[PDB]
Structures are given as C-alpha cells and as structure tokens.
Design a protein. Structure first.
Lengths: 234, 84, 96, 66
RNA sequence: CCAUAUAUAUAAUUUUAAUUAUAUAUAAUUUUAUAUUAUUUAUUAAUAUAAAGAAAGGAAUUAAGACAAAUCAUAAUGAUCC
C-alpha cells in the first residue's frame, strides 16, 4: 500500500504519459517545475506499479513485487525494555539489538525561477534527443541517471546479479563477472540494495520482476450451452 | 386464564436451573469461622466443629436437568394441535 | 478362472424392467415389449452451495401402452442425462 | 385431511394392472376383496333421536301447537 | 501391533543369561454382586463396599482445504544465464 501511494504520488506530479519518448530527468511542469531525485533514476512509468493495492492480497498477486527499501537501526534501551513478554515478545499466532525497518520514499526538487531556467527547460525538452535509453544504458552516467539497485544482489563466485530500476524506465537484470572486469566485479561484490550502480556490466537483460503485472456474458454462455447440450442429447 | 401458544419450532428451556446441593465442607467452615468470630479464636466452645471440619475436608478439601428431553419428547402429544 | 460366486463375466428398458420386477413385482415382458417412452422435458438445474454451483440433469418422461395406461416419471442425476432419463423411465413405469 | 381415494380402490387399480398385463399373477387377496367390497361413501349422517333419553332431534314446534 | 500374564515347542542347561532365548497360541475394550445417590426407573450411570482376575500402559493405520518452503539437501520438468 505504501509503495502504491508513492507510485501514485510520482505519477500525478510527473504525468509520464504526457511526455512519452522523453528519457532522462528534466524538470516537469506540474512557471512550476519539479524533478525526481531519489529513488527513481528516470521519470517514465514506474515498472512495478499495479494501481490497486488489493491485488497484492489475492492468490494471483502473491508473486507481485513492490519498491521498498530497508535499513537497520540500533534498538535503544527503552525499545529493548518495551518488547518483552507475552504481549510483544511472543508469537501472536534469539532477539536482536537492532530493527530492520522497511519504508518507501520519494524526493522531488522544485526548479528555481528565472528567464534562464525556464527557457533552459524548454530548449532541453525541444532540441535534446537524448536518445532511446536502451536496456543496459547508464543514462547521463551521473548520480541523476545511475540505475537503482532494488533487490539484494546475488553474489556467486565470479559473478554478481543485480535487479535494477534502470534509467531506461525499465526493470533490468545485470550480471557483472570477474572475466569481464576485475575492478567492476570487485565493486559489484560489495554493492547492496538501495545503492546506485554506476558501472557497466557484461550481461544486461530484461528483469522478470514485472512478470506478474501485465496480467492485471459467460453466465449467458453457460445457460445457452446447457440448454443446447440438453436438447442435443436426444 | 389460559394462554395457549402457537405451533412452536421447539419446546425448550434456555438455561434449565438445577439442584446445586451445597458443599458440606464450606458450611462447616463458615460455621467454624462464625464461632471463632463470636467466641474467640481457638475457642473450646466449637472444637467439635473443628473436629468435624477436620473429618470432612481430610481427603478432599471440597468433600443436570432433564426438562428439555421430556419437553421435546412430549411436545407433539400435549400441544393440543388440531388434526391434520 | 476365479469368478466369485454370484458374479458374471463381462438395454436400458431391460434394466428398468428387471429392477422394477424385483422391486414391485410388475411384469418385465410387458414393460419391454408394450411400453413406449417419450421424454417430455430435459433440463439442467443448478444449486448454489458453498463450494460452487452443482448442476443436475432433470428429465420428465411419459410412458404408455397406447391402450389406456399412461405414467409420468421424473428423474434427476448429477452425472449424466442417461441416468436422469433412466430414473425418469423407472418412475414413469411405477406411476402407471 | 382430504378424503382419501387410493385405500378403498386397491381392487380397481389392481384390476387395471392385471388387464393391461403389467401384473401377471393375481394376488391372493384379489377375489376376497372382490367378493367383500369396502364402504366408500365416507358421508356425514344425520340423527333424529338422542339414544339415551329418547329426545327427538330436528323437530320445530309451530305457533299453532302453542 | 508392541508391552504385560500364561500355555506348547525348541536348547543333549559349557555360546548358561532355563531368573534365559524366540517361534506359535491364549487373554481384557475385564467381569459379577450388593448398598447409597440420582435416572429417560433398570436389564441405566457414578460412587462405596464385597468377589474373580497378572491386567496397569502405548503405537500405527483416510482423505479434503489453507498457508509456508528453492540446505526443495522432499524431486522432476521447463525457462534463463556461463
Ligand atoms: S525506483 Fe523504480 S521501481 Fe522504485 S518507485 Fe521509482 S520508478 Fe518505481
């Protein structure tokens, strides 16, 4: 539900459908302009958004994925002393010194106001064919367009698999191998969910985290078929 | 006056009350405590009660109605319903 | 062979006649060679239950000997229309 | 309860079964019931005298007789 | 079916533990008699007291729904990648 709230809030501010074929981050109208800083590396349609939260509750949207991020926070004493006993320490049907919190979040900046900035946004929207950011692209190759790691990467000997929300507007799977590059593999072997991946990879394919997304009178036919078959038996 | 009822789906008492016989042990204990309140604690005037208490609580400290069955069994017979 | 005693090695009117002769003592020969059945209505009815809709086949048939004897029969089967019609034929012969 | 028809006409229905051929063998009771018919009127019958005291039921005394 | 109690068989009683071993069978899901309580009135139940009993425990054995699980190391197939 929280992810759906952020997704909708992103959509209404941005209107992705109103600027098709516009890759990159340019401030967007809403004299008023605003741009997504984090966690999104693009301003196209969010790849994980399915409009209605209730779809997650069903038995067909149990494989759905949503954009959240995790952190660990030390438990202060008062927290440790609170979660004790049959109320808060048992299973309602070892402990830690920290809690993992899940959260969704969104950050926008509003542009400044100036004859420079206004015409700058107009010109950059007009004559800048930044190009179709294909799968595997890093966009601007800056903080503002680097892919977003949105799943815990899988780290096996000599290769690291990352699920990214890419600046191409899409949901990508990147594999970094030692044989491709020792340095980039070394960096990838320490990457974590929530980072921005700033380097290229060897294998860059379409991520299947959105698989269970696109898939989200008969009474009269039953009645007529019943009567037709019943008169056909004879 | 006689108040005849309509044909009922049943004839049942919701919470039939039963003969809860009082425990002898508790009665003896209450009498003994009353005796100690009036005639003083460890009084000899009701040592018998103490004895009796000791004799009755020694092994164990503490020493259903059938109306619905018969009502269901007999309702069709007595209800005075007219013949089919 | 190991045929159990009371078992035989490995049409509908014949089975109706045999069953009804065993159950009611009516003549099988009359049923098989002098009665004509004619289905009158053949329906799919349905009942809503907690585990979905359960469909049943309903058959109303008439049987008679064209000589002043007639009987209506109703049959109902959750599996096949053959079975509902068989039961309707049975009932019709019983209601002559 | 409705006056029943099918208890007192078992002979007629049995004879229809026998004539049609639906029943082969005549039952053992058939000739007995044929020779001893059931009562099949089931009427309410008036009474004109109290059996116990002899009082006449259903007489009106006219003004000429008073 | 274990276990428990008993019977038969087997052991040339130095492979000795015959107070044993392990095959087969039997036994109980105990039963009878009163007394007091209640009773749907006994040919019922409980409690108590007597009588006979070694008799007092345990395991397995079917489906149907719901959710979880990839050390699913309870697999197979498929997809994808090197
Ligand atoms: S980072 Fe990607 S998946 Fe997450 S909210 Fe933004 S667009 Fe959607």
């Amino acid at each position: 539900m929280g992810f759906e709230i952020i997704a909708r809030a992103r959509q209404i501010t941005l209107r992705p459908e109103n600027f098709p074929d516009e890759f990159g981050k340019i401030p967007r109208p809403w004299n008023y302009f605003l741009k997504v800083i984090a966690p999104c590396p693009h301003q196209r349609k969010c790849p994980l958004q399915v409009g209605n939260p209730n779809f997650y509750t069903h038995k067909e949207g149990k494989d759905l994925k949503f954009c959240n991020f995790q952190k660990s926070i030390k438990r202060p004493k008062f927290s440790i002393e609170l979660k004790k006993g049959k109320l808060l320490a048992t299973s309602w049907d070892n402990g830690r010194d920290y809690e993992i919190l899940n959260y969704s979040y969104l950050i926008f900046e509003r542009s400044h106001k100036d004859e420079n900035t206004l015409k700058e946004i107009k010109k950059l929207r007009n004559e800048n064919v930044n190009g179709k950011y294909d799968i595997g692209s890093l966009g601007d190759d800056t903080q503002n367009s680097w892919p977003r790691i949105i799943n815990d990467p899988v780290k096996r000997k000599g290769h690291v698999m990352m699920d990214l929300c890419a600046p191409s507007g899409e949901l990508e799977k990147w594999t970094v191998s030692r044989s491709f590059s020792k340095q980039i593999y070394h960096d990838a072997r320490k990457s974590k969910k929530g980072d921005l991946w700033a380097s290229a990879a060897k294998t860059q394919i379409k991520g299947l985290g959105d698989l269970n997304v696109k898939k989200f009178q008969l009474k009269k036919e039953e009645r007529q078929k019943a009567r037709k078959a019943m008169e056909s038996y004879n | 006056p006689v108040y005849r009822l309509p044909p009922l789906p049943r004839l049942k008492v919701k919470k039939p009350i039963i003969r809860q016989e009082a425990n002898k042990c508790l009665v003896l204990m209450s009498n003994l405590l009353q005796c100690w309140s009036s005639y003083g604690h460890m009084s000899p005037k009701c040592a018998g009660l103490v004895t009796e208490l000791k004799s009755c609580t020694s092994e164990s400290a503490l020493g259903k109605s059938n109306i619905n069955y018969h009502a269901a069994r007999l309702y069709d017979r007595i209800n005075g319903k007219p013949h089919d | 062979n190991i045929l159990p005693p009371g078992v035989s090695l490995p049409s509908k009117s014949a089975d109706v006649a045999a069953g009804l002769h065993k159950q009611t003592g009516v003549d099988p020969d009359y049923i098989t060679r002098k009665l004509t059945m004619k289905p009158l209505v053949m329906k799919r009815v349905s009942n809503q239950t907690g585990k979905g809709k359960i469909a049943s086949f309903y058959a109303l048939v008439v049987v008679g000997d064209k000589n002043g004897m007639v009987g209506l029969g109703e049959g109902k089967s959750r599996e096949e229309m053959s079975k509902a019609i068989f039961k309707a034929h049975w009932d019709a012969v019983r209601n002559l | 309860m409705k006056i029943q028809t099918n208890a007192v006409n078992v002979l007629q229905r049995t004879s229809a079964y026998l004539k049609s051929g639906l029943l082969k063998e005549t039952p053992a009771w058939y000739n007995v019931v044929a020779s001893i018919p059931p009562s099949t009127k089931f009427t309410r019958e008036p009474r004109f005298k109290n059996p116990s005291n002899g009082h006449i039921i259903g007489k009106l005394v006219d003004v000429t007789e008073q």
